[PDB]
């Protein structure tokens, strides 16, 4: 009877804007329903979600008490302002980590540090702390974005790569295994949805997976589920590494007949039924809702 302390920031921590909260809630629900088949889940949720889970209501300020009684933990939280980093570093002092080490998260959380870590090992876009000569967009050094003539303090400048926006879900352990290749649908530099699996050719898939793997092998400490954001122009360009569960995971059960938990446990895909995950306002048939925001998972094609 292994106890898994499961925690997601929007669902169990501080209140965040509904737009982002709906994704966190979806991931927590998905993780809860998946890992509960392999561990006895321990943890708590915010009052607003007391009716959705068979867990007690509590404040994140009391998470130590839960960690002290757990055999493992999995923390899902935004990299923003080193939140994921600090939460993980705190948890590491108690039990086994099913996710990445705080050491690795400190690197992936800072895009400038990640750039220097990856540049000589895998293809990445030109990145700088000042304006670039090539078409570029600015983005916060730490954040889970847009055109600007200048680079404000705390931001990086990064070459804009035109092409297919994707993400690769990997299981990092003794070896690196590809769990899924997802297509990202972006609107105004913001992820509006994902298609699982990606609508790409097999060759493009192979290349994108090859480069995603190459990227994670660069960062010591990554472990468990890791997401890699990539843009395929004429080749794969690694844009970001999320050392934590990412939204596309919510579609795994419907798309593959296997949860991220099943996949991390060595289980294999049972079927392939392409799904579209999308963020919307007051959708009639959502997976989860937060305020007027809804996150849907629907069959595609």
XYZ file of C-alpha atoms in Angstrom:
301
model
C 0.000 0.000 0.000
C 2.153 2.839 -1.326
C 0.902 6.331 -0.497
C 1.248 8.953 -3.226
C 0.993 12.601 -2.237
C -0.599 14.188 -5.313
C -0.616 17.985 -5.559
C -1.479 20.435 -8.362
C -1.201 24.185 -7.718
C -4.501 25.481 -9.133
C -6.530 22.685 -7.528
C -4.757 22.525 -4.156
C -2.699 25.689 -3.729
C -3.332 29.389 -4.279
C -6.180 30.722 -6.380
C -5.046 31.575 -9.913
C -6.942 32.991 -12.899
C -9.629 30.581 -14.159
C -8.121 30.380 -17.647
C -4.993 28.691 -16.295
C -6.819 27.028 -13.410
C -8.993 24.956 -15.735
C -5.874 23.291 -17.162
C -4.426 22.578 -13.727
C -7.735 21.152 -12.523
C -7.915 18.930 -15.608
C -4.414 17.620 -15.003
C -5.102 16.938 -11.321
C -8.321 15.074 -12.151
C -6.515 13.098 -14.847
C -3.583 12.314 -12.530
C -5.919 11.402 -9.665
C -7.932 8.965 -11.811
C -4.776 7.457 -13.250
C -2.437 7.053 -10.284
C -5.185 5.889 -7.912
C -4.892 2.514 -9.651
C -1.250 2.225 -8.622
C -1.120 4.108 -5.322
C -3.350 5.102 -2.462
C -3.685 8.833 -3.058
C -3.045 11.188 -0.159
C -3.439 14.946 -0.294
C -5.985 17.747 -0.142
C -7.885 20.188 -2.338
C -9.012 23.806 -2.116
C -12.563 24.427 -0.823
C -13.920 25.287 -4.291
C -13.223 21.728 -5.445
C -14.343 19.847 -2.342
C -17.251 18.319 -4.287
C -15.050 16.883 -7.044
C -12.629 14.661 -5.142
C -12.611 12.054 -2.399
C -9.930 13.968 -0.495
C -10.098 16.329 2.485
C -10.034 20.109 2.129
C -6.893 21.792 3.455
C -4.379 24.594 2.905
C -1.108 24.067 1.072
C 0.431 25.620 4.185
C -0.128 22.198 5.787
C 1.378 20.068 3.004
C 4.286 18.998 5.236
C 1.859 16.904 7.305
C 0.839 14.996 4.177
C 4.392 14.571 2.885
C 5.412 13.079 6.243
C 2.904 10.261 5.706
C 3.587 9.594 2.016
C 5.835 7.092 0.221
C 6.070 9.136 -2.971
C 4.937 12.476 -4.333
C 4.052 14.121 -7.620
C 3.873 17.894 -7.771
C 2.257 19.697 -10.684
C 2.714 23.463 -10.627
C 3.693 26.377 -12.861
C 7.415 27.032 -13.308
C 6.566 30.724 -12.805
C 8.764 32.495 -10.260
C 10.380 29.149 -9.424
C 7.173 27.847 -7.833
C 7.485 24.320 -9.232
C 11.131 24.412 -8.171
C 10.521 25.428 -4.549
C 7.594 23.056 -4.056
C 9.569 20.119 -5.432
C 12.716 20.971 -3.468
C 10.592 21.015 -0.309
C 8.965 17.669 -1.103
C 12.275 15.949 -1.945
C 13.172 16.140 1.747
C 10.367 13.668 2.536
C 9.826 10.847 0.044
C 10.394 9.419 -3.432
C 9.807 11.823 -6.316
C 7.807 10.503 -9.286
C 8.713 13.716 -11.092
C 11.919 15.613 -11.876
C 14.536 16.719 -9.330
C 14.541 20.332 -8.128
C 18.056 20.565 -9.584
C 16.743 19.832 -13.089
C 13.663 22.023 -12.590
C 15.840 25.004 -11.671
C 17.351 24.785 -15.161
C 14.177 24.121 -17.161
C 12.325 26.851 -15.238
C 14.666 29.584 -16.464
C 14.550 29.798 -20.261
C 17.888 31.613 -20.347
C 19.575 28.887 -18.322
C 17.837 26.238 -20.430
C 19.078 27.921 -23.608
C 22.706 27.778 -22.444
C 22.214 24.181 -21.319
C 20.820 22.989 -24.665
C 22.425 25.155 -27.385
C 25.429 22.930 -28.039
C 23.510 19.668 -27.750
C 20.280 20.124 -29.711
C 18.733 22.581 -32.154
C 17.241 25.616 -30.408
C 16.202 29.034 -31.716
C 18.525 32.023 -31.404
C 18.064 33.359 -27.871
C 19.350 36.505 -26.167
C 18.824 38.890 -23.251
C 18.618 41.771 -25.725
C 16.863 42.339 -29.082
C 17.829 39.962 -31.893
C 18.387 40.892 -35.538
C 16.139 38.060 -36.705
C 12.368 38.091 -36.228
C 11.878 37.434 -32.522
C 9.316 37.498 -29.735
C 9.877 38.181 -26.062
C 8.889 35.943 -23.169
C 9.412 35.884 -19.383
C 12.535 33.988 -18.306
C 10.290 31.986 -15.967
C 6.713 31.231 -17.017
C 4.655 28.218 -18.049
C 4.767 36.445 -24.849
C 4.622 38.574 -27.975
C 6.349 40.996 -30.317
C 8.317 43.833 -28.744
C 11.023 46.188 -29.962
C 12.798 45.988 -26.606
C 13.469 43.212 -24.106
C 12.169 44.140 -20.644
C 14.088 43.096 -17.526
C 13.322 39.489 -16.672
C 12.552 38.521 -20.280
C 14.507 36.864 -23.065
C 14.410 37.542 -26.786
C 13.907 34.449 -28.914
C 13.885 33.844 -32.642
C 10.400 33.080 -33.921
C 10.259 29.681 -35.577
C 7.541 29.308 -38.205
C 6.103 25.825 -38.533
C 4.175 22.983 -36.921
C 3.853 23.527 -33.153
C 4.201 20.286 -31.212
C 5.048 18.763 -27.854
C 6.484 15.348 -27.007
C 5.445 13.481 -23.871
C 8.339 11.427 -22.546
C 8.871 8.977 -19.689
C 12.366 9.576 -18.309
C 13.959 6.782 -16.308
C 16.679 4.212 -16.958
C 15.920 5.083 -20.575
C 13.806 7.717 -22.310
C 10.545 6.490 -23.808
C 8.133 8.419 -26.012
C 4.607 8.259 -24.652
C 2.940 10.577 -27.139
C 3.555 13.257 -29.757
C 0.985 16.040 -29.579
C -0.007 18.882 -31.853
C -0.408 22.301 -30.250
C -2.946 24.843 -31.468
C -1.778 28.362 -30.685
C -3.708 31.632 -30.685
C -1.949 34.910 -29.873
C 1.110 33.046 -28.572
C -1.164 31.147 -26.187
C -2.020 27.450 -26.283
C -5.711 27.156 -27.187
C -5.739 23.400 -27.655
C -3.920 20.193 -28.527
C -4.528 17.239 -30.831
C -3.496 13.815 -29.505
C -1.867 12.202 -31.370
C -0.420 14.864 -33.668
C -1.593 15.021 -37.272
C 1.910 14.685 -38.719
C 3.765 12.312 -41.033
C 5.687 9.411 -39.524
C 9.017 10.892 -40.622
C 8.298 14.222 -38.915
C 7.202 12.321 -35.814
C 10.441 10.309 -35.743
C 12.598 13.433 -36.108
C 10.686 15.380 -33.461
C 10.893 12.469 -31.014
C 14.601 12.012 -31.749
C 15.328 15.656 -30.967
C 13.058 15.712 -27.904
C 14.972 12.758 -26.484
C 18.276 14.431 -27.338
C 17.110 17.492 -25.385
C 16.138 15.712 -22.170
C 19.323 13.654 -22.117
C 21.112 17.009 -21.677
C 19.495 17.758 -18.321
C 20.525 15.565 -15.398
C 17.724 15.129 -12.888
C 14.760 14.876 -15.243
C 12.641 11.926 -14.195
C 9.157 10.599 -14.860
C 6.839 12.462 -17.206
C 8.499 15.324 -19.065
C 7.024 17.429 -21.838
C 9.137 18.976 -24.599
C 7.796 21.834 -26.730
C 8.998 21.825 -30.326
C 8.357 23.747 -33.532
C 9.057 21.937 -36.787
C 10.051 24.298 -39.590
C 12.513 22.446 -41.810
C 13.773 20.562 -38.746
C 12.877 20.204 -35.057
C 13.597 23.249 -32.888
C 13.385 22.706 -29.116
C 11.565 25.616 -27.486
C 10.839 24.517 -23.933
C 11.054 21.646 -21.471
C 8.270 21.190 -18.933
C 9.590 18.951 -16.166
C 6.050 18.182 -15.005
C 2.759 16.872 -16.351
C 1.440 18.918 -19.281
C -2.166 19.407 -20.432
C -2.072 16.898 -23.338
C -1.952 14.182 -20.669
C -5.669 14.622 -19.961
C -6.443 13.098 -23.369
C -4.464 9.881 -22.842
C -7.305 7.708 -21.484
C -9.626 8.488 -24.389
C -6.913 8.654 -27.048
C -4.891 5.600 -25.997
C -6.918 3.625 -23.489
C -4.068 4.221 -21.046
C -3.489 6.951 -18.459
C -0.122 8.619 -17.938
C 0.044 6.404 -14.838
C -0.434 3.264 -16.932
C 2.231 4.468 -19.346
C 4.733 5.352 -16.618
C 4.079 1.899 -15.181
C 5.288 0.282 -18.398
C 1.797 -0.317 -19.725
C 1.224 0.098 -23.436
C -1.340 1.842 -25.632
C -4.598 -0.097 -26.041
C -5.981 1.814 -29.023
C -5.588 5.029 -30.970
C -8.564 7.384 -31.122
C -7.421 10.909 -31.969
C -8.680 13.510 -29.507
C -8.818 17.289 -29.513
C -8.300 19.025 -26.179
C -9.457 22.635 -26.173
C -9.968 25.504 -23.786
C -13.260 27.316 -24.233
C -15.914 29.403 -22.519
C -18.977 27.643 -21.094
C -18.792 24.586 -23.357
C -21.840 22.342 -22.939
C -19.918 19.075 -22.504
C -16.647 19.826 -20.676
C -14.179 17.540 -18.927
C -13.799 20.113 -16.125
C -14.815 23.728 -15.521
C -13.511 26.680 -13.500
C -15.665 29.790 -13.514
C -16.743 30.439 -17.108
C -13.810 28.446 -18.488
C -14.147 24.864 -19.684
C -11.674 22.309 -20.973
C -13.030 19.775 -23.443
C -11.701 16.506 -24.830
C -13.487 15.423 -28.016
C -13.012 12.754 -30.673
C -11.362 14.182 -33.798
C -11.858 12.654 -37.288
